[PDB]
Design a protein around this ligand. Structure first.
Ligand SMILES: CCCCCCCCCCCCC/C=C/[C@@H](O)[C@H](CO[C@@H]1O[C@H](CO)[C@H](O)[C@H](OS(=O)(=O)O)[C@H]1O)NC(=O)CCCCCCCCCCC
Ligand SMILES: CCCCCCCCCCCCC/C=C/[C@@H](O)[C@H](CO[C@@H]1O[C@H](CO)[C@H](O)[C@H](OS(=O)(=O)O)[C@H]1O)NC(=O)CCCCCCCCCCC
Ligand SMILES: CCCCCCCCCCCCCCC
Ligand SMILES: CCCCCCCCCCCCCCC
Lengths: 200, 200
């Protein structure tokens, strides 16, 4: 759904929406992506657990950061749902940049059947800042398991079997409100000084 | 707790016990192990979700396999809690073999400060059969992140700071009922023809 004019992101609906994302990792043709599915689902579960404690107090994502800042003092933002959402958003941004790169026709002219270049750009823009050497090396190894472009687009078409062109048009439309929402989440972290820059 | 004479493993208590395991992965000094934590926690969550549907019908692990065999016909055992426990047990066996290898004094004489040889033996005995090439390569990369032996033993001592010798004695005692329990789970899969041998 489009953002409301005030740009507040309702937590409940957000959680319902993002919970559709992990199952797509089971559509990528490689069990290599199972642990990624699980880590993202863990972030979502942690945010849901906090929300469920008091759905009014945590009605919006903005409320989560505001309330937790007040609740946790010196340990914040490296705590609670603020931390879980900090990581979740990085995964959401990876997906944004990846999909946008594919839709924008970016490709390796000698491997046009792969999506490695798109995944690498997304990784650099969303995650690499926060990863040490061994994690980067595992990402590089995992790229071998990334699906062929055609197979990837087939994972997104609801089985239906449309053309690549039709699939990409649907992704382009999806990206409008998706990108807008992720941008608001990033803005909130920035404006609240809630972003951390430690490496894993 | 020791096995009852009839060797039935009560599901509730089992779930309570195994839920202590994922947090140990956060004590290993490397965020590389977070996705492993998450995958194991996912197995546990899936078994708990089935159990919670009907705690009497699923009172024991044996009941889970028996009931699901009857519930799911041709799709079983690649379904439900049977599948989740099939994978969980492989992780439990890895931990068994790893700990036992350390306790038995197995080491690489030119890297006695590492636990790579112990992890490799555990991997070979518990998981490698079920992993294709890229997953094996990721395991090998991840070994770089494995803690030094001293640090690993410090993760198990409840903070306390005992000698390595004391830590290993405690692990040896732990392994008695742990190994017995995992052996019963493996036996159940074998006797029910519930084991699968597909690779990921
Ligand atoms: C052998 C086969 C298997 C396996 C593995 C293959 C792929 C592995 C990719 C390597 C990169 C991730 C490895 C490490 C991940 C995690 O360590 C980090 C931080 O994870 C966070 O850590 C926090 C504490 O600092 C809290 O515990 C968070 O927990 S919480 O409780 O606060 O919620 C937790 O998520 N998450 C990350 O780096 C985020 C990664 C997002 C990934 C987005 C999709 C990427 C798609 C890539 C396509 C190639
Ligand atoms: C960049 C930094 C990060 C990341 C990654 C580092 C380590 C990665 C290790 C690679 C091996 C695991 C990679 C793949 C894992 C998973 O694909 C498999 C099957 O996973 C199962 O799949 C089933 C469908 O077939 C169901 O979906 C199960 O879901 S369910 O819903 O049925 O419950 C699901 O668990 N589990 C496995 O292979 C089990 C692995 C157990 C591991 C035990 C501890 C190992 C300790 C090793 C010490 C070195
Ligand atoms: C190698 C990276 C894989 C990224 C997984 C993307 C899954 C989410 C895609 C959601 C887009 C839905 C568009 C509707 C057609
Ligand atoms: C590199 C493999 C790491 C294995 C993680 C083991 C965690 C579970 C250990 C439980 C043993 C508890 C003994 C009590 C002192």
């Amino acid at each position: 759904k489009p953002l409301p004019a005030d740009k507040q992101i309702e937590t409940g609906p957000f959680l319902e929406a993002v919970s559709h994302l992990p199952p797509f990792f089971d559509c990528l043709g490689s069990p290599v992506f199972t642990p990624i599915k699980a880590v993202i689902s863990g972030n979502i579960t942690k945010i849901k657990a906090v929300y469920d404690t008091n759905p009014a107090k945590f009605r919006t994502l903005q409320n989560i950061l505001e309330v937790e800042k007040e609740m946790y003092g010196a340990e914040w933002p490296k705590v609670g749902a603020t931390l879980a959402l900090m990581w979740l958003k990085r995964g959401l941004r990876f997906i944004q940049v990846f999909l946008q790169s594919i839709c924008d026709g970016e490709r390796d002219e000698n491997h046009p059947n792969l999506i490695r270049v798109n995944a690498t750009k997304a990784y650099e823009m969303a995650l690499k800042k926060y990863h040490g050497w061994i994690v980067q090396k595992i990402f590089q190894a995992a790229l071998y398991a990334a699906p062929y472009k055609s197979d990837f687009l087939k994972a997104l078409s609801k089985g239906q079997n449309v053309t690549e062109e039709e699939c990409l048009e649907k992704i382009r439309l999806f990206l409008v409100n998706y990108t807008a929402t992720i941008d608001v989440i990033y803005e909130m972290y920035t404006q609240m000084n809630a972003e951390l820059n430690y490496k894993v």
